Amino acid sequence: GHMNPPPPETSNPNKPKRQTNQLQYLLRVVLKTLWKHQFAWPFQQPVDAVKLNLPDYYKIIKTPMDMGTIKKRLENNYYWNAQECIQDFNTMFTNCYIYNKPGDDIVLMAEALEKLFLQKINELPTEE
């Protein structure tokens, strides 16, 4: 534990909003494809350090990120540029690699998800 921090902010009415084909793709294709993956479930919500009894998790990870937060930030037009969203997915994978040991089952899961993420990002449509 001892306590989990509050989840990352997903909405801000002060931030200007815009819909772009790249942001639409990140939600409709990238997030959706990663969400349905067999290894997605531990990445769908913040790390529950209390349930897992990991008091050092939020001592090590100061920038937590999960797909449920990315989903809500996309639905709330929290990102202005697609690069901000791509960065949150990169933070999510990086936190897993920093916290856990290489070869751990959770790391192998994050790696398969990252492989699928990078394939979809290679297919990111040109800005319209």
Ligand SMILES: Cc1noc(C)c1-c1cc(C(N)=O)c2c3ccc(C(C)(C)O)cc3n(Cc3ccccc3)c2c1
């Ligand atoms: C991702 C990620 N990166 O580092 C950490 C640590 C996580 C992370 C995040 C979460 C979470 N979102 O709470 C869970 C989680 C939730 C519930 C359960 C139970 C067995 C109780 O069902 C087990 C869980 N494990 C452990 C785990 C280990 C190996 C394979 C799959 C899961 C997690 C690992």
